Design a protein around this ligand. Structure first.
Ligand SMILES: NCCCC[C@@](N)(CC[C@](N)(CCCCN)C(=O)O)C(=O)O
Ligand SMILES: NCCCC[C@@](N)(CC[C@](N)(CCCCN)C(=O)O)C(=O)O
Lengths: 305, 296, 305, 296
């Protein structure tokens, strides 16, 4: 137990990553359309898939359904280059550690663990929470900071102190709308993998040292997000910003309403899923926003299966 | 409509070596009964509902039911969740085991729309035949239940009868009670207990009640008897402890206060909750020296 | 110079008070409609008038026009019970002290001085700013806290420490949407006059010890606001809340857009002023909000001249 | 369109016994010229425009004009106001006295609507024939200039050519430059200087430039020559001073820094601005020990 973990060997999960929607069909999860949807991601240059995130409706899934979609994501990318960074966060520490051990023993390449929501833990509670998770598994741990949906914020000091104190934790996914914090993170701890959780600012984050994205827009346009990320990591910022500017219109209309309501609306209107099913308290969008998503979608080339 | 109002307590959940100490829970509730409390709210956010298991959540509702059997005190069990099928299961859980009503927090983390909140609460209301009190706490859920959403649920379902506002928005409480005066507005913010009940509010769901149940009971009962002079004097006299109980995220400071008053054995939280800094630990006991803490 | 000023003799300006709109006619100020508009306030039970506030467009008036409307407000209430609490705040201390000395030497009964805007002074700068103003005049000083429009907040400690340290400062006008701060102020310093700057919460503030309001809705319905305030100060809270609940609909539609754009729209549609003139960067409201204000207005009885 | 871009400095206004010390102002600007600065912005928010008189505002624009005559450095005079007739008078003020352009802050205190901002800036643009750069700082004005409002002003008036964003909203800077790529996006936030110019920004209006003009000039010129590796290294190396210069409201910390570097005689502000606490006074000098401060 030491504080000098930053430059030791860390396994990382970077590149273009996708927060997978969870398709539903007559109350259950469409396990077969789930497999089809990920194969589409594999064939479009995607580097990793994130099952059961916020886009996958982690709140409304049961413990037994959460398990099925981690196993399916692992098995469709077996034999391929694509990695599985499974969502295993929870607002209870015993729940987040219990999910982390499942993902490790079932083939996941890493885990995404969101900051505890609703109960608003303190900075010492956050250290304690993630330290228990990191010492529970031997696979990489990527923090997820989304203060607008959890009520909590992982301090830059906590993120940097966990990076140095834990040997699995190697970075964070920032959904903060705070580019200042992204300069703060990479100017004081440049050995960390800063990941974008906001599609509109995918490129500005990657131009300051970011090493990957966990996209929601990826669900609809995996090829374009794949090109944007790989252009930036190849230090080809002119072409990476060219893609980023052309994606802004769809990057924001996919959040006209709370994620993942608009993105599943796009996939229904693009024929990529049969039915427009959400699980309450999520519901189909307003009739005005339904028309707004379909209008902006006509300006992009949607790849099929 | 059947309603549950008055001075109510968001019960802390005492722990002893990692497990729920069921015997101190009953003891702590008996202290609430004997100090003028009108109802108890088991396993809310103050009760650490997030870190409890599904099987521990049930036992603490059953313990509350049996400790108030034969008394005037009602049991308003916490049954909220960010998944509607989970909240409907817990609402049906409380009904079959003797609870008089349920408190249901707005879904957290997933940020439902106004239409999602409507269908979320309607599904809960269609699961039970006992009153349902909404709970709006935007600072911890990321979403807010519109005044119109609250009013439209109040009129469409016969169990939904009010809301427990923890918003710091006195403007919203005039909006609610000027357009729907039959509604029971309950305070979820101890510092503004009097101003809310001062505009037509009919009860509180207190965190301070845990430590000073007699004073919070007096504040509420004075206001509903329209003795606002005496109800406001207690509110002004409680402001110092009402704010130091949130120096850190609830329920970290109040569980510290009850440990320093000998009312619980151990200062255990369940992660990601933890004991406070010793600087805030010293501040809470200093504020406690100015108040009269009722014992057992 | 001492810290024990709280219980010494303080002159106060309380009751129902009105932030007067400044009518314009072909670029100039309508000095004659200004006099007419205040006489309407006098004849409807109003206790005091606030010339050249935020509702009077203090930002766009010149120094010479600011002067004229303080003199006119003083002279139309000469011989009457109505008091003049002139607006004399500014983001520069030499400007706020210069205006305070004018109001004193020209017949004002007190001054309203807003917290400095734009330059965001610190709490020590705020003490310093108001202490210089208070020691410049011998007439009462009422602070004005509106953090949503200045970028600054007067700490409860600063307001209480200025109340005790200054012999003219006797209270504050809170436009904060923070009822917690109104419990904070009156629970630690009950000898202060807490004034409401938010019409929707006029009664809840008066029920916790508030002693008056500085209303914008007063411009249209002075009689109803006059009844609400005097009912509360006579401890008749049932009838004061009865008025407050019936005023909520107009209390909020008068802020569909930034004050004082909606309130002058109401007075144009009620025939109380000839022309709908603002001074840039203020402008007439959107055509949709113009219809919204007129629709809600039909449910109230508008007293004429 | 004529544009004013590059590394720019929001000039502090030094005072000496209550009056503007006009001789140190010229001296401080000469230091800016000789350290690679492209333009100077007199009497902004960093220059204490609020507490200056109308006659002092003019002299500090004229001093800036004469100190950069014969040099490559341009003068982008501050001419914003919350009243449009005042801002048009100041815009016409700068034009008749040799300024190359004007910086115009969004109206403060009175919170104009999006239509009000449009007519506010159009009136300023129709008063002068030199470029006009908008200034959006929502944390100090209470209002925000919509991306569409900025784009609609850019296309309708031939002097308006960009905006200086002090918003901490990198999302808005993608919105602006993806829908209007001919626009000159200028940074008004020193900490995010590189990420903004990294997305197509073409200059900065710095507060840190006052103390370290050579480093800020190098950061900007590296980025526009597309050497983002070297431009980002300077940005990461400046973060510590970029944040301690806002421990208190600007320009209180930076005026403290220049006093501790001997570059100004007296640490005078004009009320309601005042010297910082000695705790923050000690913190600013500690951060200064890690940077190389260019002298005269
Ligand atoms: N995907 C696996 C199921 C978890 C779903 C859950 N609703 C559970 C959150 C929970 N901690 C459940 C514990 C219930 C005990 N009261 C909660 O806060 O309700 C969430 O994480 O949001
Ligand atoms: N009602 C009397 C005229 C004041 C109008 C003024 N725009 C002036 C604010 C001011 N301090 C004026 C000083 C101008 C010197 N640069 C400002 O910030 O512009 C305001 O107070 O908002």
């Amino acid at each position: 137990h030491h504080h000098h973990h930053g430059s030791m060997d860390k396994n990382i999960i970077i590149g273009a990553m996708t927060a997978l929607i969870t398709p539903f069909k007559n109350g259950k999860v469409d396990e077969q359309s789930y497999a089809r949807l990920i194969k589409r991601q594999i064939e479009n240059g995607i580097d990793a898939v994130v099952p059961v995130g916020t886009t996958g409706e982690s709140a409304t899934l049961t413990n037994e359904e959460h398990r099925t979609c981690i196993e399916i994501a692992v098995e469709t990318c077996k034999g391929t280059k694509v990695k599985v960074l499974a969502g295993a966060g929870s607002n209870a520490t015993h729940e987040a550690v219990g999910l982390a051990k499942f993902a490790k023993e079932h083939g996941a390449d890493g885990i995404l663990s969101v900051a505890p929501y609703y109960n608003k833990p303190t900075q010492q509670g956050l250290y304690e929470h993630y330290k228990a998770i990191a010492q529970s598994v031997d696979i990489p741990v990527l923090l997820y900071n989304v203060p607008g949906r959890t009520g909590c914020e992982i301090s830059t000091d906590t993120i940097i102190k966990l990076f140095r104190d834990c040997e699995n934790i190697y970075g964070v996914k920032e959904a903060s709308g705070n580019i200042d914090k992204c300069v703060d993170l990479l100017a004081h701890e440049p050995r960390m993998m800063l990941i974008s959780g906001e599609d509109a600012i995918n490129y500005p984050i990657l131009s300051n040292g970011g090493k990957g994205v966990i996209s929601v827009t990826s669900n609809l346009l995996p090829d374009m997000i794949s090109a944007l990320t790989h252009f930036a990591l190849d230090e080809n910022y002119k072409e990476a910003k060219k893609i980023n500017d052309e994606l802004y219109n769809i990057n924001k209309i996919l959040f006209c309403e709370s994620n993942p309501i608009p993105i599943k609306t796009a996939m229904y209107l693009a024929g990529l899923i049969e039915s427009l099913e959400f699980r309450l308290p999520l519901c189909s969008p307003s009739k005005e926003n339904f028309a707004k998503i379909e209008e902006v979608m006509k300006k992009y080339k949607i790849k099929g299966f």
